[PDB]
Amino acid sequence: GILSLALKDKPALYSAYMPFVKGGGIFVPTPKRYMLGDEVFLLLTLPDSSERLPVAGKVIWTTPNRAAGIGVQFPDGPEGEAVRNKIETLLAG
């Protein structure tokens, strides 16, 4: 269904953000279990911001290390490059 992830500070962002992923990614904890290349809808709130960014992404990591979730790959369209740049901006601050 609907995933959500709220990063309050640049540390939580850096722990979620997967920079080496092809086109950026983000680790979203979820109890629910997904298979790789499953197509998810995620609502990503960045720190130092209140806007919920809408990410229609792909699973590229299943962890059941730390945390119990899924890696969500950002779409290669402009709409996803946008969120990747927002985040990369936030982290070199």
């Binding site: 080496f20 992923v21 298979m35 790789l36 792909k58 590229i60 299943t62 962890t63 290390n65 890696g71």
Partner: protein, 254 residues
């Protein structure tokens, strides 16, 4: 430069996977619509780190920065054939579709590896299907022809994925005879509900059938898609409607 140590954490994990356990393969059924049922699966690479599974979209980006893609595609092909071997020992005549890259056109080790492994596992080359996109086959043509000829010299099947796309594709077809075509998702996603698409497709199949070229559709998700692909003569279909991807070959085709 803080992250540069994390990059190497990843790269060492990768090379140790190249040489030992870590890499694995998952298998999605490809289904013959028209009705010559063939045990056919497409193989997907995966990486496992203490129960943490991960998708080549996570790590291929790094791997390319280290000209490591060729050794990986060698692993894919090789374990794929070992799996064909275990699969022949069970008494199944199973086929495996395998993504390879264009650098492996230049890979003499790949042509060796294919040969060597079919021999030991006693696998007819027509069990192996290697696919590579129309994009990178365009960029790298002389090598692609060399490779197709060498590999089809082993009764292997060679095909194009992400086919369709642009108008340069039927141009390439003059210079390249593959066993099969995998239609680009942009074409086939909407065929349920367009006129652009099914126009394009029946054009592609009408040209493709008599050449002896197999047409296959990817990312099938709904039934109207399948009736369109069927009425349209597409040969093979795979996707979450058809059958999902797993680590065991267990689909009852027919």
């Amino acid at each position: 430069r803080a992250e540069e140590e994390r990059i190497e954490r990843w790269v060492e994990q990768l090379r140790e996977a190249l040489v030992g356990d870590g890499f694995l393969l998952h298998y999605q059924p490809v289904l013959n619509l028209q009705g010559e049922p063939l045990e056919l699966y497409q193989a997907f690479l995966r990486l496992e780190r203490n129960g943490e599974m991960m998708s080549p979209n996570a790590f291929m980006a790094i791997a390319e920065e280290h000209d490591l893609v060729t050794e990986i595609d060698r692993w894919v092909v090789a374990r794929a054939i070992r799996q064909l071997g275990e699969r022949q020992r069970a008494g199944h005549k199973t086929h495996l579709l395998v993504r390879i890259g264009p650098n492996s056109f230049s890979d003499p080790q790949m042509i060796d590896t294919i040969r060597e492994q079919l021999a030991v596992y006693g696998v007819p080359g027509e069990r192996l299907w290697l696919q590579t996109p129309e994009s990178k086959v365009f960029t790298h043509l002389r090598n692609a022809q060399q490779f197709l000829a060498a590999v089809s010299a082993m009764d292997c099947k060679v095909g194009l994925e992400q086919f369709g796309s642009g108008l340069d594709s039927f141009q390439l077809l003059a210079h390249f005879h593959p066993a099969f075509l995998k239609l680009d998702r942009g074409i086939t996603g909407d065929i349920a509900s367009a006129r652009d698409s099914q126009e394009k497709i029946r054009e592609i199949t009408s040209r493709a059938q008599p050449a002896g070229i197999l047409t296959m559709a990817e990312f099938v998700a709904d039934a109207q898609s399948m009736s369109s692909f069927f009425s349209a003569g597409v040969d093979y279909v795979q996707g979450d409607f058809v059958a999902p991807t797993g680590p065991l070959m267990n689909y009852e085709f027919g």
